[PDB]
Design a protein around this ligand. Structure first.
Ligand SMILES: [Mg+2]
Ligand SMILES: [Mg+2]
Length: 474
RNA sequence: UAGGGCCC
RNA sequence: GGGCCCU
């Protein structure tokens, strides 16, 4: 986005800590080019002359403005995709009750009872459950009143900046490229869910290339679906954006919201409005108050869905900006926020597309930094999506989500106190797909100290999940 | 942490 | 209710 204002007000928003990630036994063994992100402005691992408070915000390099001509075309693209999207999902997009928004519905998990409540509740030591009853699905009086200012379109808010405590490439750690989470007030999340949760539920249940969205998918079983679909195209592209979330422009965002969440689609008129409040935002970080224009806040409700929608619209726009007679079926794609696979039988030229994406403030590069620029003839077994490759299972014939061994090693090398056992079992479900030897190796440093699920048991679990029938009558 | 999915 | 992984 564009930082239009940075100012000091006395009331310190308290965030920075030490990391909670301690190394495991495997760190000594794997020695990964990874480590926890810097959370302190004087972290010794930081390069000489780096300011964390700086780099943290260096993603806001502006809010690209679009011409009337470009705006109109983007609007047609957003209108065209909305049209495909709602034809598939239906138009059952009515608001959710307070209850529904809280407890979830068929396809949408419950709100999280004990995560960050946002501002100003954080500055009063109140916790989310002080404000909302998650057993019963009702709101306390401080939220009810806020709702009321939202039904009235007068509600105002600030985003709370948290540093993300997570593992990173060493290069990026040493650079101060710690990511930030933009925590919104829990009433804003609740109301957005009231406004677009039913839609979101429908998105999750219909995930797939037809709607170009993978939000709600489960890689273990969905890899077979996705694999077979993309297998049948002459060309497949793995496309990388740079700072996708932050570089959404005001115009793109506003127009998308106007085209996709129309009342004629069954949405409450305040769906558009609640969404639009994400365009111009105040961010609280320590003593600082950063006024930003443009960008998606990470960690507002529906953040991944909105990103997925924009991602679909950008591909359509970029191609139409270049070629003629380009329709929704000239290509196919699936997206999860910024992450995307695109495919087409047409010999599209993504190299030529750079400047068209550029018009929305977006910079596309090919996933393989290698040999410079987009090429033709790649297949699905060449690309990555959600940090997984599409490999063929030797024994069922189905595609399986395979994570790179360095990634797995990085992941196994660190954990939070008292969680190794749990984490091990989880990551095991991730590792099974790498095959029995590689599974044995990754887990070797844990032999004797923790319980390691057998390869066989996790393989059999996976088979039953991906096709109950190939368990049964094999 | 918005969320998705999984593990217990 | 706790945890993990991905976006
Ligand atoms: Mg990168
Ligand atoms: Mg990718």
């Amino acid at each position: 986005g564009l930082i239009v204002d940075t100012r000091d007000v006395e009331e310190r928003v308290h965030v920075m800590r030490k990391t909670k990630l301690a190394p495991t036994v495997a760190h000594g063994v794997f020695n990964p080019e990874f480590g926890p992100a810097a959370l302190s402005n004087k972290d010794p691992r930081l390069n000489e002359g780096v300011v964390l408070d700086e780099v943290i915000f260096s993603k806001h390099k502006g809010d690209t403005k679009m011409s009337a001509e470009d705006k109109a075309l983007f609007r047609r693209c957003a209108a065209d995709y909305a049209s495909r999207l709602h034809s598939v999902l239906g138009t059952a997009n009515a608001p959710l009750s307070i209850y529904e928004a809280i407890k979830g519905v068929d396809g949408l998990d419950a709100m999280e009872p004990d995560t960050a409540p946002g501002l100003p509740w954080a500055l009063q030591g109140k916790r989310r459950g002080a404000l909302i009853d998650f057993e019963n699905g009702t709101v306390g009086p401080e939220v009810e009143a806020a709702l009321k200012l939202m039904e009235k379109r007068e509600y105002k808010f600030a985003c709370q900046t948290f540093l993300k405590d997570e593992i990173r490439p060493m290069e990026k750690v040493r650079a101060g490229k710690t990511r930030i989470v933009d925590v919104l007030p829990v009433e804003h999340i609740l109301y957005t869910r009231m406004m677009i949760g039913r839609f979101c539920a429908q998105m999750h249940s219909n995930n797939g290339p037809q709607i170009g969205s993978a939000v709600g998918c489960n890689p273990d079983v969905d890899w077979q679906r996705f694999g077979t679909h993309f297998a049948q195209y002459r060309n497949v592209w793995d496309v990388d954006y740079s700072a996708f979330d932050a570089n959404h422009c005001s115009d793109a965002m506003n127009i998308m919201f106007e085209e996709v969440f129309r009342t004629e689609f069954g949405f409450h008129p305040n769906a558009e409005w609640i969404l639009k409040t994400l365009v111009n935002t105040e961010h609280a970080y320590e003593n600082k108050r950063i006024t930003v224009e443009g960008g998606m806040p990470s960690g507002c409700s529906a953040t991944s869905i909105i990103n997925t929608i924009l991602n679909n619209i950008y591909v359509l726009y970029a191609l139409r900006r270049h070629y003629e007679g380009v329709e929704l079926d000239t290509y196919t794609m699936i997206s999860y926020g910024d992450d995307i696979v695109v495919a087409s039988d047409y010999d599209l030229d993504f190299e030529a597309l750079k400047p068209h994406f550029k018009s929305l403030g977006q910079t596309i590069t090919p996933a393989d930094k290698s040999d410079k620029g987009f090429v033709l003839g790649h297949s699905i077994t060449d690309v990555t999506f959600l940090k997984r490759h599409f490999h063929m299972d030797y024994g069922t014939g189905f595609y399986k989500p395979v994570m790179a061994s360095k990634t797995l090693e990085a992941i196994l090398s660190f954990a939070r106190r008292g969680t190794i056992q749990e984490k091990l079992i989880s990551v095991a479900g991730l590792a099974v797909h790498s095959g029995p030897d590689e599974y044995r190796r990754l887990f070797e440093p844990f032999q004797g100290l923790f319980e390691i699920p057998s390869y066989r048991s996790l393989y059999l679990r996976w088979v039953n999940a991906v096709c109950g029938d190939a368990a049964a009558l094999e």
